[PDB]
Design a protein around this ligand. Structure first.
Ligand SMILES: Nc1ncnc2c1ncn2[C@@H]1O[C@H](COP(=O)(O)OP(=O)(O)O)[C@@H](O)[C@H]1O
Ligand SMILES: COc1nc(N(C)C)ccc1-c1cc2c(C(=O)O)c[nH]c2cc1Cl
Ligand SMILES: Nc1ncnc2c1ncn2[C@@H]1O[C@H](COP(=O)(O)O)[C@@H](O)[C@H]1O
Ligand SMILES: Nc1ncnc2c1ncn2[C@@H]1O[C@H](COP(=O)(O)O)[C@@H](O)[C@H]1O
Ligand SMILES: [Cl-]
Ligand SMILES: [Cl-]
Ligand SMILES: [Cl-]
Lengths: 163, 369, 293
């Protein structure tokens, strides 16, 4: 089974958990600072629980409830399959969630084309990759340049395009 | 009456990090100790930090460096997420520097090397741990440094910058406190620089009770060098704590420095004018008004993210392939403003790189400078 | 064969340098501006992008300049109007009118053996590496780059039976009907030999049969560089004045030493010269790779 946390946010001297999972037997919760807990595992399905806070039977109103035919207000927990796997639980949580111009960084002003083999160029900073650089239009033809990385090697492509 | 997660009994609280509570965990049978970060799913969704945690877990799982706290396993419950990590007895490095005095040149170096080794491992894995302070550097039984709390850390994407002004003001880089766009590693170098000073002096290089003068002091990059400080380390601190990120030291520049190389153990480290886009001198809103009247004129679908950041798409007339590129208007000076063209990697066709140049050439031919 | 199995194992990607340059010309670009760009950028070949077809149609090399120069030169007194005013697509449709040869390209994932075979199969020197996923050209692979890589393995791994064997006993390359020029020979005539014989270099000989210099296809690029292409009446020796001692090999020399001599001097071919310093044959980089594959 998958471990489930039962935390009691609220005061008290003695706090116990009673549930469908343990045949409604009082289970004492451990207190750290001020809060009371119990990490026990439950089979994937429907479970009903209640708390015994200092001689009083209460349900956590922040958590979902279910009123019986007999008028028994108990807390309910639907332990889902997604709640056990980390990336499955984080995926369902993302789905559940439903000026002046920036000052130019100096990194972009640094080029690998201006600063031996003419084909060979220095390794560029990850930040200047995929950025478009161009040359002043002389003889009515535009020159464009950009550095792209393929696997672990870099390729700076020059395009001579007339305009 | 034992609180157990996995097979460890949860104990006392070690502290409270970026997004969660950290507790000790002693094994039911072996007595092995772990540090458990407890993240409440409902709380980590109240802040839109759900993606931040997904990435942090992904990264820390793949990592395995001797000076970075190891993430052993992640246990998910319907209520919370439990991050099981390695436990170190020695506690905070900050506390070591407090209870005991400043470290000697030998020990200061030893620990600085270990920290920088880990800081390098992070960068080499495109992970930039922002918020790098001696409070976040932990120590083991044998005095070994260990980088912890990757809560404020972010990824280093190709072509993209970072904006978040995260971490302690004393350790934050001038660009971080100025809220300017940064690449990533350069801000960790500044943090590593202040950690180094803290080790050698026992005090902070940039500190004042008055916050405005502290920020001035950081952006002025001026700090006191005590007489006991070795001029070689003073030259390292000067290079590391440079206000200008282009004049600032790199892990390579540090590796090469004389003071660093001394007694450095083997296990720690391995081993014709061009212009960026166009410069229109018009009003920032007037430039954005011109580009939208130009993007639609060339028949291209776009989605406005920021009043200065735009994402555009165009369908090929032959291959019918849709290619993407992003536009961003930066401020060069008080008088001049520049538009930036960045490629967006998609997912047989034509050619992604040349197709991107074709797009830009169209919009440049009908734009200023 | 031992070297053939080595080439079939290593991928094209391993030959691509850590960070490189790649010049791509649009087919609509003026052909004179295209050759001047090859010079200014310092690249011997460039892939050609057809904006209408949205694909790399071909490559623009020095052979194109050699072809335009010879096909359209009238005299030094009159300008080569056809070279001055022509697009790349306009001349490509004239040159490849009857014989239509498409783009020859290799994948970075494909083996070096396939790349070496593809060069000889299509009788070319420049092979562009194109990634199938992106479609972008990454690096232009040559014989010199493969030979430099192979020579690094030959010196570390044990030398075979033919490594210690002579060049005459193994018979590698062309030895009959060698295309040559003289000192008094003009550039236009030399360019003509390059056209019909389809060879990379022409050895320059003196009054006697002895070889004094070597006029390569690379030395033609100097005319575009110095802006001296309009006078092709000039002698070969006069053209070579812009710039070394001539490198030669003998028929009795070993193949391993011949391979080492080429890569150490960084040349495309060595001249097979006899005792009296006269030309007897030739051995190209393409020939060595042929026997080894
Ligand atoms: N991949 C290719 N696709 C199309 N044509 C090509 C390719 N490679 C070379 N060519 C053509 O082959 C001819 C001869 O080229 P080549 O032998 O490679 O010359 P060079 O030795 O100067 O590089 C030229 O007309 C050139 O355009
Ligand atoms: C009182 O709570 C605890 N007590 C433990 N003891 C060793 C007594 C251990 C762990 C917790 C805990 C704390 C939190 C939390 C918080 O404290 O904010 C959020 N979600 C939690 C989930 C658990 Cl299991
Ligand atoms: N001057 C030359 N005369 C005759 N054949 C040559 C000459 N130069 C090279 N070859 C041959 O041309 C072929 C291709 O070589 P290359 O174009 O020089 O790289 C090879 O078979 C060479 O032997
Ligand atoms: N056998 C040779 N000896 C000396 N130089 C040579 C030889 N063959 C070619 N060259 C020179 O190599 C240059 C051209 O290089 P490439 O054709 O790329 O190998 C020219 O400067 C030629 O003069
Ligand atoms: Cl804390
Ligand atoms: Cl320890
Ligand atoms: Cl301190």
């Amino acid at each position: 089974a998958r471990p489930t946390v039962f935390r009691w946010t609220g005061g008290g001297k003695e706090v116990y958990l009673s549930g469908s999972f343990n045949n409604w037997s009082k289970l004492p919760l451990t207190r750290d600072h001020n809060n009371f807990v119990a990490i026990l595992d439950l089979p994937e399905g429907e479970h009903q629980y209640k708390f015994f806070v200092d001689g009083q039977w209460t349900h956590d109103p922040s958590e979902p409830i279910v009123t019986s035919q007999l008028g028994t207000v108990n807390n309910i927990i639907q332990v889902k399959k997604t709640d056990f796997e980390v990336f499955d639980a984080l995926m369902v949580d993302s789905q559940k969630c439903s000026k002046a111009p920036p000052i130019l960084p100096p990194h972009l002003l640094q080029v690998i084309l201006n600063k031996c083999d003419p084909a060979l160029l220095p390794e560029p900073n990850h930040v200047m990759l995929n950025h478009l650089y161009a040359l002043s239009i002389k003889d009515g033809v535009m020159v464009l340049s950009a550095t792209h990385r393929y696997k672990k090697k870099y390729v700076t492509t020059l395009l001579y395009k007339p305009i | 009456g034992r609180v157990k997660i996995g097979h460890y009994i949860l104990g006392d609280t070690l502290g409270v990090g970026t997004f969660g509570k950290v507790k000790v965990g002693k094994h039911e049978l072996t007595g092995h100790k772990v540090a458990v970060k407890i993240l409440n799913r409902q709380k980590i969704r109240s802040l839109d930090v759900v993606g931040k945690i997904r990435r942090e877990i992904q990264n820390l799982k793949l990592f395995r460096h001797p000076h970075i706290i190891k993430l052993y396993q992640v246990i998910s419950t319907p209520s919370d997420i439990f991050m099981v990590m390695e436990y170190v007895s020695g506690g905070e490095l900050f506390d070591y520097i407090c209870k005991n005095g400043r470290l000697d040149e030998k020990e200061s170096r030893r620990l600085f090397q270990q920290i920088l080794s880990g800081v390098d491992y992070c960068h080499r894995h495109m992970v930039v741990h922002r918020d790098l302070k001696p409070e976040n550097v932990l120590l083991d039984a044998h005095m070994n440094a260990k980088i912890a709390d990757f809560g404020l850390s972010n990824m280093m994407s190709d072509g993209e910058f970072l904006r978040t002004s995260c971490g302690s003001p004393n350790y934050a880089a001038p660009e971080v406190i100025s809220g300017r766009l940064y690449a990533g590693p350069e801000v960790d170098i500044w943090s590593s620089g202040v950690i180094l000073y803290a080790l050698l002096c026992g005090t902070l290089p940039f500190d004042d009770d008055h916050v405005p003068t502290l920020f001035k002091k950081i952006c002025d990059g001026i700090f006191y060098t005590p007489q006991y400080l070795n001029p070689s380390v003073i030259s390292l601190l000067k290079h590391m704590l440079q206000v200008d990120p282009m004049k600032r030291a790199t892990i390579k520049d540090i590796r090469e420095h004389e003071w660093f190389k001394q007694d450095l153990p083997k296990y720690l480290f391995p081993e014709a004018k061009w212009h960026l886009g166009i410069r229109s001198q018009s009003r920032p809103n007037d430039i954005m008004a011109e580009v939208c009247r130009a993007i639609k004129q060339l028949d291209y679908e776009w989605k406005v993210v920021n009043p200065y950041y735009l994402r555009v798409r165009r369908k090929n007339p032959v291959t019918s392939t849709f290619s993407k590129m992003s536009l961003q208007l930066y401020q060069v000076d008080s008088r001049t403003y520049l538009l930036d063209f960045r490629s967006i990697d998609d997912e047989r066709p034509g050619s992604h790189t040349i197709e991107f140049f074709e797009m830009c050439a169209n919009l440049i031919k009908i734009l200023a400078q | 064969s031992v070297y053939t199995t080595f080439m079939k194992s290593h991928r094209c990607y391993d030959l691509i340098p850590t960070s490189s340059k790649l010049v791509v010309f649009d087919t609509s670009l003026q052909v004179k501006k295209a050759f001047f760009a090859l010079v200014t950028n310092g690249v011997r070949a460039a892939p050609l992008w057809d904006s209408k077809k949205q694909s790399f149609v071909g490559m623009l090399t020095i052979t194109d300049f050699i072809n335009i120069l010879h096909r359209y030169y009238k005299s030094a007194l009159v300008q080569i109007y056809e070279l001055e005013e022509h697009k790349i697509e306009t001349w490509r449709e004239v040159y490849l009118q009857d014989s239509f040869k498409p783009l020859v390209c290799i994948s970075p994932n494909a083996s070096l053996f396939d790349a070496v075979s593809s060069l000889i199969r299509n009788k070319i020197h420049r092979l562009p590496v194109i990634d199938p996923e992106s479609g972008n050209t990454l690096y232009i692979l040559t014989h010199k780059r493969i030979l430099k890589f192979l020579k690094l393995f030959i010196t570390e791994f044990p030398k075979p039976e033919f490594m210690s064997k002579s060049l005459e006993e193994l018979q590698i390359g062309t030895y009959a009907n060698i295309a040559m020029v003289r000192t008094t020979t003009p550039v236009y005539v030399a360019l003509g030999i390059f056209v019909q014989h389809r060879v990379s270099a022409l050895p320059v000989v003196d009054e006697k049969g002895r070889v004094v210099d070597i006029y390569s296809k690379f030395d033609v690029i100097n005319l575009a560089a110095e802006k001296t292409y309009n006078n092709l009446d000039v002698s070969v020796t006069k053209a070579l004045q812009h710039r070394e001692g001539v490198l030669k090999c003998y028929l009795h020399e070993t193949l391993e030493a011949i391979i080492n001599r080429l890569v150490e001097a960084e040349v495309h071919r060595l001249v097979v010269v006899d005792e009296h310093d006269v030309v007897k044959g030739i051995v190209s980089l393409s020939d060595i790779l042929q026997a080894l594959v």
